[PDB]
Amino acid sequence: GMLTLIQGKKIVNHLRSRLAFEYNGQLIKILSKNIVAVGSLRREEKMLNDVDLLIIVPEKKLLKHVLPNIRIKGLSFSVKVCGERKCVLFIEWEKKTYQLDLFTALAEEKPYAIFHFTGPVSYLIRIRAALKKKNYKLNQYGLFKNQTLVPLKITTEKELIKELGFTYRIPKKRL
DNA sequence: CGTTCTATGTGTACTCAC
DNA sequence: GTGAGTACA
């Protein structure tokens, strides 16, 4: 069920105004500023296996509800797997079935989440390997030295990459 | 000593014993 | 409930 970069962007553009979740009866819309395209789509690969969306949820209490009660106005989908942090959907788009992957992160995690979910995997592996040799650990939630969050005065992914000590490259060029 | 090749990470969701 | 183990972000 493969698709083009253009089809990818069409769908993401369509979902951007339509994602919401049920929170104890009421239907809360997810805001565009908290929807970030990730994976191969953000890396502008000509062909994609799926669409990967990162949702930034504004508080920890809400994690229990967003993905497990995710809603998409006017589009039929089925749920393959679903937990608080990762959700996989099969959506119907123009009489065709496409795979939509949803992930979640808290605001304090945004740049780590983006850095992780942008990929590619081989780039994650090598960046992390390097940090391990200097006794740091990195993941989707933060940077670490001996079980402790390194507080970093940074907001964007670019700021994080440069803080970590690596060449910043646009997603297309990461490898 | 230099060139080149190779290997490498960290966490989530689900299922199935006991 | 906990923990082993697979599949896979």
Next chain:
DNA sequence: ATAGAACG
């Protein structure tokens, strides 16, 4: 990125 191993 980086470091070890095989090769020159």
